[model samples]
Target chain A: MIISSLTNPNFKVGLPKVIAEVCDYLNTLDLNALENGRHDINDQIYMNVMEPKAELHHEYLDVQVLIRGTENIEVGATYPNLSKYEDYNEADDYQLCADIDDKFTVTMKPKMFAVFYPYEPHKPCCVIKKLVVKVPVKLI
Target chain B: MIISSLTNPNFKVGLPKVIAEVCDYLNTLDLNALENGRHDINDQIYMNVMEPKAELHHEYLDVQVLIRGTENIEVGATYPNLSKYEDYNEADDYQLCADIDDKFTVTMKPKMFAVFYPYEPHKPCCVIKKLVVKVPVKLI
Candidate 1:
C-alpha cells in the first residue's frame, strides 16, 4: 500500500499509468460539491462515498483520499483470514471484513490518500466525506 | 512504498502495469546467476545490482528485491532535504541523499521487495546480492 498527501503533485510521480490518470482527474475535482454516491472518473474506474464499512477487494485497488473531515482506516497486517470470515462478493468486487483487527489503522486527513492493493484489507471507520477511487487490477 | 514477499505471485496484483511486467520477468529469472551490473528488462526499464550504496531517484521508481541476503533500507519522511545536500544527476536520474535521517527503515529478506517512488529518498545498506529494477516515471 502507498500513503502520501496528494497536496503535493509529486505523489503521482511514480504511480502506475492508470493510477496517475485517476490522480490527474482527482486533482481538479471539487469534492465538496459532489454528493455521497458512486462517481465515475472513466469507464474503467470509479469512486465511492458511501456508508462506512470495513472491506477488502481482489480485482480492484482502492485509492482512498480524504476530502473533508478525518478518517481512520484499519489496514490488516496480513491478508484477511478467510477461515475466520468467508464472504467475497464477486459481483460488487468487495468482501466485508469489518471484524478484522485494527492494529494498523492509518488516519487520513484532507488531501491525504492511501492506495490499497488487492488483498490489502482496509476498513473505512469514519463516515467522513472522502473519495475512494476504484482502479481495476486488470488495468494495473 | 510497498513491500511483500515475491514468493507470492499475488504480490503484483495492484502494481502499475510496467511494474507488474517486470515482476513477471523477475519471477522466472535466475537471480543467482546474474552479476552485479545493469540489465534491461525492457527499453524503458532496467535492473541494477551494483556495489550497494545509498541514494534516491527522480525519474525512476525502484523495485528493490533481496535475492541472496538480508537488506535494510532507510526511508525518509520528507521528499528530500535539498537545502541540506543537493546534487541531482540528470543523466543517471538519481540524487545523493545519504545525509538524510534514518528514522524509518524497512528490512527485506530473500524474495522480499520494496517499491520506492520518485523523490522518495531511500538508503540501501549492505553489499549482498539484490536486484533494483528502475521503472521510469514516464512509463509509470
Candidate 2:
C-alpha cells in the first residue's frame, strides 16, 4: 500500500492515525534510556536507538530524531525513472536509488526530528545516538 | 482561520480542493506567455510571474515555482515563542519573522515547484525569474 502522508509536523485526526501514533510513541520514549538496538514498541512498531544507518524501505514509515550527535538526511522525491542503486530486497526490506535531482537536506541535531514517508528515499548520515522508529506499513 | 493543509502534493479528494484547483489552474496556464505581474486566476486566487520577493503570509498558500534562474528556500518549523520581526499586515497579507533555527533549504532552478503551508515560514535566498501563485485561505 502506498503510504498516505500528512504534511503537518504535528498530527491531525482528519488524516491517517499512523503519523500521530508514531509521533506519540517518539514523544513517550526517554530516548536516552532505551537500549542501542531494536525495541518493539508494539506489534511491529519498533525503534532503534543507535548510530544512524541509511534506510530506503517502502514497508515502514521512519520517525527519526537526533538524540545526541548531528547528521544529514537528504530529502528527495521519487520519480518515474530514477537510477536504481539496488533492487528491492524483501528479506531485509531495503532498496537503493541514485541520480536524484532537486534535493533538500533535513539535518538532525539534538532536539530536532524528521519524518520520512514510505518510498520517500531519505539518505541518512548519522552517528552519536540517534533514534529511528520503524512503524510498519502493516499498521495501516 | 489556520490554513488547513492536505498531505498529498498532487492533491486529494477527502481534503480541501484549493490545492488541486491551484495545481489544475497552474497546469492550464501558458506560463511562458503570462506577463510578469499579477494575474487573477479567479476572484482572490492570483498568480505572480515576476522577479521573486520574499513572502511570509499566513493568509495565502504559496505555490512557488522557478521559471528561470536559481534560488533557495529555507524550510523551518514554527514554535510558540518565535521572534516576530514585523507585525501582521492585513492590507498586505504578510507577517515577517526572524531568529528561526533548524531550517532546510528548498532551492529553485527550473522544472521545480514547492508548496508552502500557512505559518510554515519558508525563506527564499535565491531567485531570478520566479513564478509564485498565491492561493488565498479564503479559497478554503
Candidate 3:
C-alpha cells in the first residue's frame, strides 16, 4: 500500500490517468455540495463519496482521497480475528469486520490520499464529527 | 505493501527477479545453518538474517521472507510518537522507536513474506522464544 499526497508533483506521475481524473474532479466540488452516492468515472473506476468508516475489502483496492475535511484513518497489515458484523456481501465484495482497537492512525487532509491493498485493513473517517466529503475510488 | 507466501506460485510473478532470487536462496538453507549476519547477493541487494524484533527504517524497504519457524509481525501505518531508544544513526538509516501499543499482527510462516514500506512501522520477532532465522532484505 502507498500513502501519498496529490499535491506532491513527484508522486503524481506514478499514478494512473483515471486516478488523476478523480482527484481533479474532487477539487472542483465544494465541501457542502458533496452528497453520499456512487459516481462512476469509468468502467473500472468509481468514486464513493460518503462518511468514512472502518471497513475491509477482499477484492478491490481503495484509493481514498480526502476532499473536504481533515480526518483520521487507521491502517494496518491484517484484520483482527473478530467476528464479522454480518455475512460477506458478495455483490459489494466486502466483509465488515468488528471494530478493532489496534491500528496506525494517519491524519489525512485535502489533496492527500492513501492506497489500501487487499491485505491492508483501513478504518477511515473516525475523527470527523461533522459531515465530511471523501472520495474512495474502488479499483478492481 | 504486499503480503504473500513464497510457496504461493500465483503471487511470485508480481515480484522482481532479485527478490525472487533471495527467496529461492533462503529456501535452500536449513534452520541451524542460519546465522545473524549480512549476506550480499549482488550490488544493490543483500540478505540480513537476524532475530526479528520491533524496528522501523527511514531509508530501505524491508522484504522479509520467513525461511523457517513461525513468527508474528505487527505492522502499522505510522510510527508511535515517543522517544527513541537511541539517536538516529545516519549511516544505518534507522532509529529504534519506543515500544508503544497499536499495530496489526500477521503470523509469518516458512513460505510467507511481507514487504514493508518506509512509513510502515513493523514490530517483528515478537513471539519466537528460541533462535529463529528470518531473512529481511534491506533494499534502498
Candidate 4:
C-alpha cells in the first residue's frame, strides 16, 4: 500500500532498479514472470489522469504505480466474491462485487505504487488530474 | 515472414529488447502519462513466445506484435471493408463477418506489428507458431 509521486526520490531511485531486475528476469521467459509474487492482480499498464469514484477488484493483484500525476484511490473491505456481471467482459479476469461499504481511502502520486490484492476492492479516479499505470498480475 | 530459432542472434537480440521495453513502459506510470499518447495496441515491449492460434476480434484496436516464438496469423478477405459487416457494435467494438472465402493469409515474426484498424478485417493465428502480444487501444 505504498502511494507517492513519481518525483519522490524513493520511487524515482527505485523504479529504474526494479526495471533492471525485470529485464534480467525476462531473458529467461520464465512463467514465474507472470506471477504476482507479492504484487499480484492487475499487471496490465494503465495511466488515468482523471480520478474515478468507486472501489473495484477482480481476482488478480494490482500493482498500481504512478508515473506522472496524482489522485485518491479508494480501498474498501471485500465481501464474499460475487460473480462477474455478464455485460462486463473487460473484467473477465476477476470476480465482481455487487454491494460494498465505503471506508478505506488511499491517495497515489508519481513514483509511488500500491498492490491491491484479491478481496481488497478499490475505486480508481478520484483526483481531478493524475496519471497512473496499473498492472494486473494473475495469481495461480 | 521472418523466422528464427530461439538461439538465433536475431531472436536473442530482438525478443530481449521487446521485453525490456514492455517492462520499462509499464513500470513507469504518472499523472499525465496516459494523456501523452500512451496507447499500446500490441505488446510493444515484450516478445510473446506462446503458440499463436485463431481468434476473432470484437471492437478494440488489435495491436498484434510478435516478440518471440512463432504462429500462423489468419486474415479474412471476405469483408473487404469494415463497414460491410453484418452487424456492428460501436460500444463493444466488434463486428461479425458474413463471408468467409475472401479471407487471406500471412506469416509474421519478430519486429513485425499489425494494426487491425476498424475496416481492416483479419483472422490471425491461422498458421505457424508465433509469439505475439495483443494490445487493446480505444478509438477516441
iRMS, candidate 4, in Å: value is 24.1
For each candidate, the alpha-carbon lDDT, in order, equals: 0.72, 0.59, 0.56, 0.39
lDDT tens digits, residues B9-52, model 1? 47766566777777789988888778889998767888997545
- The segments of candidate 4 whose C-alpha lies over 4 angstroms from its true place after superposition are A1-55, A67-69, A77-99, A128-140, B1-140
TM-score of chain A of each: 0.87, 0.75, 0.69, 0.47
* Candidate 1 lDDT score at position A21: 79
Candidate 1 chain B lDDT trough over 10 residues, lowest sum: B97-106
TM-score of each: 0.65, 0.72, 0.54, 0.29
A1-140 per-residue lDDT for model 3 (tens digits)? 45555554334333444555666765576634666677666566666767544566656667776765777777654444536444566687666655643355656666556766554557774563222222233431
lDDT of 3 by residue, B52-119 (tens): 44566556667777766777777654444437545567786666655634355666666557766544
- Candidate 4: chain B TM-score equals 0.42
Residue pairs with clashing backbones, model 1: A17-B140
Off by over 4 Å in 2: A1-16, A42-44, A52-55, A78-81, A97-99, A135-140, B1-17, B41-44, B52-55, B78-81, B97-99, B136-140
Score candidate 3 by lDDT.
0.56
* Residue pairs with backbone atoms closer than 3 Å in model 2 (clashes): B71-B126
Interface RMSD of each: 4.9, 8.4, 7.2, 24.1
- How accurate locally is residue A114 in candidate 3, as Cα lDDT from 0 to 100? 70
Error (Å) of candidate 2 at residue A95 is 2.0
Clashes per candidate, residues 3 or more apart or on different chains: 1, 1, 1, 63
Question: What range of 10 consecutive residues in model 4 chain B has the weakest lDDT sum?
Answer: B1-10
